[PDB]
Design a binder for this molecule. Structure first.
Ligand SMILES: *P(=O)(O)OCC(C)(C)[C@@H](O)C(=O)NCCC(=O)NCCSCCN
Length: 514
């Protein structure tokens, strides 16, 4: 759970009086000492509601270490002969592709504009190095009577897919097209690389497409970092000089599945967290009464669109200050605003919102390539018509309770709650909200001038997905990924504009009833 880390950083900043704090910043190096540690401890006790002492700050002086400390064995690397192991995340992502024709909805794109057209032969060499380094990028998933089995391809046997694509038409729609092309997870590695060139592009656009089975959005930064390292080494005619990974994805999965235990074991973390969710999701609505343009079709298509809401830097700043002043994360403010929006549209007082939560606290995977996002149902109650400030308190309590049981796999939660099912409706929630932060310092990759370009998706995973996305340097926008079966594009533009309006009012006056 990243939220503990963000709150610690928040406290460091207010106590040390700096706008300086990152996940790796040492409290004592930043000007903290034993006396000031009292104020960190006191504030964290009031915001997180757990026993913290100077003890923990001494042992774990960084926000990353402190957050992981006050919340299970460390990931251990297995032997060189170690067979691959699929995490329950990967098994669920494989299962999604069997239940539905997703049309590429579970591919994740990463697109980088480059001022120089890259060398396709060096690029292919660098991708091979990237795949050799990260086993998850060359792990196939084959079906069997049972379910899926991992198949780890040897580096020599991992046929990478790297190609140049000339752009006649515009590149942004071409990016969406390349992103949606399907992976056969049983025969192709879950990574595709395309270099878009053309008379209308200056340099090239480098497109990495992963299947989510091998990458979440936190994988963008190590993917670009490692690919940049391999590219520049191969351009110089040598293999990259790599510090080996502290852990492969299968190491993480084996450790996690061993600690999780079996659901029939009453002392297992799995059963204990499932029992929490069974009670926390009792009497859940099948779905929220949302204003759609078309009824829910019999078959889900995963066709989608993308509507953006721009946020003035003043608004971004006000939202950060509103979060800091109420002791919540920026995500929590966005989540509360989504709940108010659905509430005002007539969804009721019981608002379940799905949200991805990264399981990346262990230092061995904090910055590695893989899929670590569990999906949690964050159940927001809005009865009693409280203020926005009251709702921020409710949302913090709901989220911290939930984040303490973030390891129960979402598919096991569904199996435990047993909601009424329907293929055209995602179970337990149909609206997701998340907070995302794009990589910083990716401006000078591959010896050129580089910048990320966002890819307009033609797919959607739920009815609605709201993402508060920070670019790598202080900018932010809201992206609404909507199901095209249900919403016209103009309806989605209006929804995401209303979300911004709720945020404007909240920062202006959070003592206003919702
Ligand atoms: P933090 O690590 O920044 O600071 C810890 C301090 C406050 C320095 C703490 O360790 C401390 O005060 N140490 C000094 C303790 C000491 O000297 N005790 C002996 C006093 S002489 C009395 C003999 N009878």
């Amino acid at each position: 759970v990243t939220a503990y880390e963000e709150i610690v950083c928040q406290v460091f900043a207010a106590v040390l009086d700096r706008s300086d704090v990152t996940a790796d910043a040492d409290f004592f190096a930043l000007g903290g000492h034993s006396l000031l540690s009292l104020r960190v401890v006191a504030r964290l006790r009031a915001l997180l509601g757990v026993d913290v002492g100077v003890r923990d700050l001494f042992e774990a002086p960084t926000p990353a270490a402190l957050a992981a400390r006050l919340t299970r064995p460390a990931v251990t690397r297995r032997g060189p002969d170690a067979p691959p192991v699929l995490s329950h995340f990967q098994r669920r992502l494989w299962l999604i592709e069997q239940v539905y024709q997703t049309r590429g909805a579970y591919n994740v794109p990463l697109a980088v504009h480059v001022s120089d057209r890259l060398d396709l032969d060096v690029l292919r060499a660098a991708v091979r190095d990237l795949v050799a380094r990260h086993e998850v990028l060359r792990t196939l998933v084959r079906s069997s009577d049972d379910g899926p089995d991992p198949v780890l391809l040897a580096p020599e046997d991992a046929a990478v897919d790297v190609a140049e694509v000339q752009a006649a038409g515009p590149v942004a729609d071409l990016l969406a097209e390349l992103t949606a092309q399907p992976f056969d997870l049983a025969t192709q590695i879950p990574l595709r690389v395309r270099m878009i060139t053309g008379e209308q592009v200056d340099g090239c656009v480098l497109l990495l497409v992963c299947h989510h089975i091998a990458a979440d959005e936190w994988s963008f930064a190590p993917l670009l970092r490692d690919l940049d390292t391999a590219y520049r080494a191969r351009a110089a005619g040598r293999a990259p000089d790599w510090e080996p990974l502290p852990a492969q994805y299968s190491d993480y999965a084996a450790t996690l599945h061993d600690w999780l235990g079996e659901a029939t074991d009453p002392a297992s973390p799995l059963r204990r967290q499932l029992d929490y969710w069974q009670h926390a999701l009792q009497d859940l609505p099948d779905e929220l009464d949302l204003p759609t343009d078309r009824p829910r079709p019999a078959t889900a298509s995963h066709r989608g669109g993308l509507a953006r809401a721009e946020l003035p830097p003043e608004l971004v700043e006000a939202v950060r200050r509103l979060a800091a002043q109420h002791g919540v994360t920026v995500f929590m403010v966005v989540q509360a605003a989504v709940a108010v929006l659905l509430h005002r549209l007539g969804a009721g007082d019981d608002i379940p919102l799905g949200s991805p939560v990264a399981d990346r606290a262990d230092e061995a995977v904090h910055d590695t390539v893989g899929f670590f996002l569990n999906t949690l149902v964050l159940r927001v109650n809005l009865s009693g018509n409280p203020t926005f400030a009251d709702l921020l308190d409710r949302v913090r309590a709901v989220d911290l309770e939930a984040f303490a049981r973030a390891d129960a796999p979402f598919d096991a939660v569904v199996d435990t709650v047993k909601p009424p099912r329907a293929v055209s409706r995602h179970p337990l929630f149909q609206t997701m909200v998340s907070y995302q932060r794009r990589p910083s310092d990716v401006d000078r990759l591959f010896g050129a001038a580089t910048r990320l370009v966002e890819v307009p998706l033609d797919t959607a995973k739920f009815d609605l997905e709201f993402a508060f996305i920070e670019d790598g340097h202080g900018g932010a926008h809201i992206a609404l990924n909507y199901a095209a079966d249900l919403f016209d594009h103009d309806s989605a533009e209006q929804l995401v504009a209303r979300l911004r309006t709720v945020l404007e009012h909240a920062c202006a006056d959070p003592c206003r009833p919702v």
